[PDB]
Design a protein around this nucleic acid. Sequence first.
DNA 1: GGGTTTCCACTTATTCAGGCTTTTAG
DNA 2: CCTAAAAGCCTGAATAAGTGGAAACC
Length: 295
Amino acid sequence: RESINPWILTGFADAEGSFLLRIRNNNKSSVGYSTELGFQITLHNKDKSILENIQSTWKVGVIANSGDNAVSLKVTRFEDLKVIIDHFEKYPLITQKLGDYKLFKQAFSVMENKEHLKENGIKELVRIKAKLNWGLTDELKKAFPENISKERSLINKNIPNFKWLAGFTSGEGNFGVNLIKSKSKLGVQVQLVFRITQHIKDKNLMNSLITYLGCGYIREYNKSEFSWLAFVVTKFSDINDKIIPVFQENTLIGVKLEDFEDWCKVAKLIEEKKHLTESGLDEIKKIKLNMNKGR
DNA sequence: GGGTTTCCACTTATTCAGGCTTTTAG
DNA sequence: CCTAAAAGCCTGAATAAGTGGAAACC
Ligand SMILES: [Ca+2]
Ligand SMILES: [Ca+2]
Ligand SMILES: [Ca+2]
Ligand SMILES: [Ca+2]
Ligand SMILES: [Ca+2]
Ligand SMILES: [Ca+2]
């Protein structure tokens, strides 16, 4: 069905994609190892249409269930990876994942000249995999006795355009309706909230949202060793003037588009001050009940 | 072929999204 | 007061990332 704008695709890939390089013990293989290179996205079943739309925009990849509640798009067929490369050359990633893309690209070169069927090339793929995502397993590191660096250039890039932002937000965004309980008259204060969430590794990008969108603040959380950030907009005039117009003009994808639409409906109610009456408050309540985790 | 590529079922780790309450601003 | 905006928690699952196994094939 619908194809996806390329910058929206890149922004959603910055959010939900991952590159992959398997180096597998294989006794039937000449060098003792077989490889598989590619790029993949795993989403909840409700958003399978996105994967099919990506599959039809690029015309590559295979779709399969990933457990009971999720579905994946996986591109590993070697020739079709040239499409992945051409897309991300023209429409490049901006998060730390760009670093993983560059490794994917180096690994493609190795395999494009058949060097991975030789000892030298497998050894290079191991050095590449060492810096890719979570790196080498203990067994792989010990099977390749040499000083292999795990570090890589930090990525620091700016948001290229609102299309990238809409793809990224379709992955990490949250259009929330906070029903703030109060012993007040009607009691609950309706508060529209926009939020983007990201691991602290892209702090610089998150901070730039405040500059880029003209609003919001950055909150920091952590759970044990794991830290992340939330960009959060609460002032309704910023939501109604600076946030809703961006996504009206750069359309979201997936079920989160429906969530943003309902969110706008509540924004209208709030604008009309109708959120201060039992009728508007009850309409808001049913709208919130039927969106996000109630969808 | 016979190594090698590709695909499909499935799993494990954590970074997200999200629903919630309390406090302050104006 | 009254309402809007900010501060803030923190859980658990939709992600990210990865593996086992075998068919397909060049
Ligand atoms: Ca992400
Ligand atoms: Ca294919
Ligand atoms: Ca191929
Ligand atoms: Ca998402
Ligand atoms: Ca973990
Ligand atoms: Ca805070």
